[PDB]
Design a protein around this ligand. Sequence first.
Ligand SMILES: [Cl-]
Ligand SMILES: [Cl-]
Ligand SMILES: [Cl-]
Ligand SMILES: [Cl-]
Ligand SMILES: [Fe+3]
Ligand SMILES: [Fe+3]
Ligand SMILES: [Fe+3]
Ligand SMILES: [Fe+3]
Ligand SMILES: [Fe+3]
Ligand SMILES: [Fe+3]
Ligand SMILES: [Fe+3]
Ligand SMILES: [Fe+3]
Ligand SMILES: [Fe+3]
Ligand SMILES: [Fe+3]
Ligand SMILES: [Fe+3]
Ligand SMILES: [Fe+3]
Ligand SMILES: [Fe+3]
Ligand SMILES: [Fe+3]
Ligand SMILES: [Fe+3]
Ligand SMILES: [Fe+3]
Ligand SMILES: [Fe+3]
Ligand SMILES: [Fe+3]
Ligand SMILES: [Fe+3]
Ligand SMILES: [Fe+3]
Ligand SMILES: [Fe+3]
Ligand SMILES: [Fe+3]
Ligand SMILES: [O]
Ligand SMILES: [O]
Ligand SMILES: [O]
Ligand SMILES: [O]
Lengths: 170, 170, 170, 170
Amino acid sequence: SQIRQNYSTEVEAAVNRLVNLYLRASYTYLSLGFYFDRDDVALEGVCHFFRELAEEKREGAERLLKMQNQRGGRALFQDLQKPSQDEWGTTLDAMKAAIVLEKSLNQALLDLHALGSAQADPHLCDFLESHFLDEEVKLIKKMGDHLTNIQRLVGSQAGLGEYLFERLTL
Amino acid sequence: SQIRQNYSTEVEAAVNRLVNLYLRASYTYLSLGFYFDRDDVALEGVCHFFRELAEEKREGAERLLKMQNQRGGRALFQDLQKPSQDEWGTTLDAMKAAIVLEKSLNQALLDLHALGSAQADPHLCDFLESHFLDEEVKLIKKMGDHLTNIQRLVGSQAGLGEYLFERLTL
Amino acid sequence: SQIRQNYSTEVEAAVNRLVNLYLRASYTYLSLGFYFDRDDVALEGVCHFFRELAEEKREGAERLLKMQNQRGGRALFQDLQKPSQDEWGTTLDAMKAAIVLEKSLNQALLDLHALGSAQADPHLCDFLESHFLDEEVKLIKKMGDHLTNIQRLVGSQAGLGEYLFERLTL
Amino acid sequence: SQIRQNYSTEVEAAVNRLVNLYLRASYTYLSLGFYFDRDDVALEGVCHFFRELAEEKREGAERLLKMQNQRGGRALFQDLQKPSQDEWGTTLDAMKAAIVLEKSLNQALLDLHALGSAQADPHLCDFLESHFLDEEVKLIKKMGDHLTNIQRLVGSQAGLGEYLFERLTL
Ligand SMILES: [Cl-]
Ligand SMILES: [Cl-]
Ligand SMILES: [Cl-]
Ligand SMILES: [Cl-]
Ligand SMILES: [Fe+3]
Ligand SMILES: [Fe+3]
Ligand SMILES: [Fe+3]
Ligand SMILES: [Fe+3]
Ligand SMILES: [Fe+3]
Ligand SMILES: [Fe+3]
Ligand SMILES: [Fe+3]
Ligand SMILES: [Fe+3]
Ligand SMILES: [Fe+3]
Ligand SMILES: [Fe+3]
Ligand SMILES: [Fe+3]
Ligand SMILES: [Fe+3]
Ligand SMILES: [Fe+3]
Ligand SMILES: [Fe+3]
Ligand SMILES: [Fe+3]
Ligand SMILES: [Fe+3]
Ligand SMILES: [Fe+3]
Ligand SMILES: [Fe+3]
Ligand SMILES: [Fe+3]
Ligand SMILES: [Fe+3]
Ligand SMILES: [Fe+3]
Ligand SMILES: [Fe+3]
Ligand SMILES: [O]
Ligand SMILES: [O]
Ligand SMILES: [O]
Ligand SMILES: [O]
């Protein structure tokens, strides 16, 4: 590559794997979204929340791919595994699965940051800082908040709690 | 008829019966609507939902009648039977009765489509496709959703659930 | 399902497979798009054309999933295979691969239409008619046109032809 | 200096040398710009591209000088060497010389970042991250793209290719 400079093969590979993880996450959110749109689940606000996250994760992958091209790396795509479940249980179960997912993306972002630091690649480090690490921290906080409110609600009267959360928070 | 072309007597008759079914449905919804406006039921949002459906069904009948005239068929009207109940129970009972009603209209629309197909009447088929079959599918989905939410709500505290559904969904 | 009516398991399954094919197509277009954004390929208009198609195919899948929920079917997601190539050659090679892809989606849409017809499912038939079959026909025509123009251009002076196509058509 | 804090003499010196390199680059671009404005070269779009880069590099130097004052360092200016050529050959030759130049600025920015990291100077590191490293990466990508397009064009018919690039890309 005429342009490639200070961009290790190790970072390039890790960026490709991070793209796969974000597309996998987007796919998980698409599945969570359409589950909550089932006539026998019918929580539109929960569906809308997850459809929006499917879009953000897809945009995450696209920014990574653009960055990969800008540094002179080569995008390589792999099979995208299907989501870990076909049915996602209650809003509580789903929001728990979403926090697990986001923390695993976050950890992957931190691992890549560590690698960039080890390879003295400040451009990589700054690009993760600017566009990924703060968004993940904010999102995980918002999910933790939602989780707390769902739990407080689904003490007695679980059905009533799920409905009220969907109507008044989402 | 100077204009009538490729329009069987079998289709004409079935269109007249479909008009009767839509007017009967409109009448059912008028009765459901005013039941929920009773001072001893007093669920305004439920009343408004059914009054709106009374209007859509009436419009359904009018489009069918207009189509019948456009093809050179002859509208024939019959007695309209009164609704199947005088009192409609809870929001849950009503929404169940409404889904039963809509599925019976839907089936009548499918039977007429089958007949149009058998008679090689693509105009009839397209007119049902365009104006009736998709609307019924969307409406039945919306009713199934409402039904799911009512059920989730009326676990314990049935009165509280019915109130919240009316206030926050309808 | 309280709502499901005239929706065979055979159609439900075929809809799920069609969703997989559209997501696979979207993924192919994402890969074609970022290939043309490589510093050593650098045909921005070609990149933009394929990124737009990635978005349309994703929207295709989402409309199918919404329809599946509306009929009372159950979305099931599978692994998404990676695109058939990692590097896509010239604009000519890419546009040929895109036409092959679209014709395979089109054929899948026709097969599903045939099945809907066999199962007397006019709602399915109309939904494919309205939202998929005409778009595919228009898109394939636009790709055939592009292909003809690329070929006319890359007689002698292949590099000059590819550049001019990107600048003046895309 | 009353204000100077955590700002090593090693960083101060390196900032002064980086200022010299950016002013030298600005001067190179001024020379490239006016070469392409010669009546016997007459590629206005190429002239405009390089004049714009002369301005960006000058602005780069000014931001560095402002930063040097903000940290309590002392700007020191040195002789600015004249550009490495008096005539710059074809658009292809010029864009190659420009990529070489930018990569040498980029490397200087990375070396300074490394030094800031070694000296535990996070303000320096963040200031380079924010205002210099991403701009260089984007610019080098844009130059690599331009280079690819020029090369594709100047296969046969070099004169025709240079003209078309200037008219339709720049
Ligand atoms: Cl290097
Ligand atoms: Cl006739
Ligand atoms: Cl059935
Ligand atoms: Cl100090
Ligand atoms: Fe959105
Ligand atoms: Fe966003
Ligand atoms: Fe968004
Ligand atoms: Fe967005
Ligand atoms: Fe940093
Ligand atoms: Fe930083
Ligand atoms: Fe109205
Ligand atoms: Fe209407
Ligand atoms: Fe209306
Ligand atoms: Fe109206
Ligand atoms: Fe038809
Ligand atoms: Fe778009
Ligand atoms: Fe679209
Ligand atoms: Fe679009
Ligand atoms: Fe769109
Ligand atoms: Fe049809
Ligand atoms: Fe049709
Ligand atoms: Fe300017
Ligand atoms: Fe500027
Ligand atoms: Fe400027
Ligand atoms: Fe400026
Ligand atoms: Fe830092
Ligand atoms: O977004
Ligand atoms: O309506
Ligand atoms: O779209
Ligand atoms: O600038």
